[PDB]
């Protein structure tokens, strides 16, 4: 179930509002006829929207907000018509259906990728329905930021092996299930296969590519949802003892490949 909006260059606002909106999203047709779409999309996604309309004359997700006077996920798919734009905001759901699920083989194939510094550049869309992270939430942060601490000490050896193997013309050696936190805070186990691109001559690690196929869903299903917190621990003798192995896998980007 979707619904549409429409506009463009002279101001914004919204002209139409598919009568299927007082349903799918909460409020009435002419209810939106009021002002600019743009100020309906979460302060967050806002930035990418006005950059995807400029880069068009498709598809990309953003977070829209219901109306009661609880933002929800959406997958805007636009179309440039003669001007004005037709936006069919289809809502997006959470791929997991049970709890501590054990996804089959069909399970989507979503692959995030990152720079030596440890920052994810591109990030498949197939990952927004199984990680509750709309690209923009990520695409720009530190990949090491996610991994589970009681893990990066054994995670390291995995990353390393992407050099040793990344020393070949494009070797791919499949990792072993490793925890990784979603949007709701839970931890899934991806069945990650790796591969990197080392600049042939400067012989440096340009970027990593992880063909992430999920292997086990969250304790509490419904990715997106709300984000709690119960995980602390010796935030002194280890919350810094780890930053050691992290900021060590960062400096483990240097040539020697």
Numbering used by the authors: 238 to 294, 309 to 320, 334 to 346, 364 to 538
Can you provide the manuscript's text about this entry?
PERIOD proteins are central components of the Drosophila and mammalian circadian clocks. A structural feature shared by many eukaryotic clock proteins are the PER-ARNT-SIM (PAS) domains, which represent a diverse and ubiquitous family of sensory-, signalling-, and protein-protein interaction modules. Examples include the Drosophila (d) and mouse (m) PERIOD proteins as well as the bHLH-PAS transcription factors d/mCLOCK, dCYCLE, and mBMAL1, which contain two tandemly organized PAS domains (referred to as PAS-A and PAS-B) for protein-protein interactions. Whereas the PAS domains of dPER are involved in dTIM binding, the PAS domains of mPER1, 2, and 3 mediate homo- and heterodimerization of the three PERIOD homologues in the mammalian circadian clock.
On the basis of our dPER crystal structure, we have constructed and crystallized a shorter dPER fragment, dPERΔαF, containing the two PAS domains but lacking the αF helix. The crystal structure of dPERΔαF was determined by molecular replacement using the refined dPER structure as search model. Consistent with our gel filtration studies, dPERΔαF crystallises as a monomer. Overall, the structure of the dPERΔαF monomer is very similar to dPER with average root mean square deviations (rmsds) of 1.1 Å for 230 Cα positions. In the dPERΔαF structure, the intramolecular PAS-A–PAS-B interactions are unchanged compared to the dimeric structure with helices αA′ and αA*′ of PAS-B packing against strands βC, βD, and βE and helix αC of PAS-A. Although traceable with confidence, helices αA, αA, and αB and the βA-βB loop forming the Trp482 binding pocket of PAS-A are represented by somewhat weaker electron density and higher B-factors, suggesting them to be more flexible in the monomeric structure. Furthermore, the βA-βB loop of PAS-A has changed its conformation compared to dPER, likely as a result of the missing dimer interaction with Trp482 of PAS-B. The circular dichroism (CD) spectra of dPERΔαF however closely resemble those of the dPER fragment reflecting no changes of secondary structure composition apart from the missing αF helix. Consequently, dPER dimerization does not require major structural rearrangements in the two PAS domains, but stabilises the PAS-A fold by inserting Trp482 into its hydrophobic pocket and possibly also by covering the PAS-A β-sheet surface with the αF helix. In agreement with our assumption, that in the clock the homodimer stabilizes dPER in absence of dTIM, the PAS-A domain of the monomeric dPERΔαF structure is rather flexible, suggesting that dPER homodimer formation stabilizes the PAS-A domain by insertion of Trp482 into its binding pocket and possibly also by covering the PAS-A β-sheet surface with the αF helix.
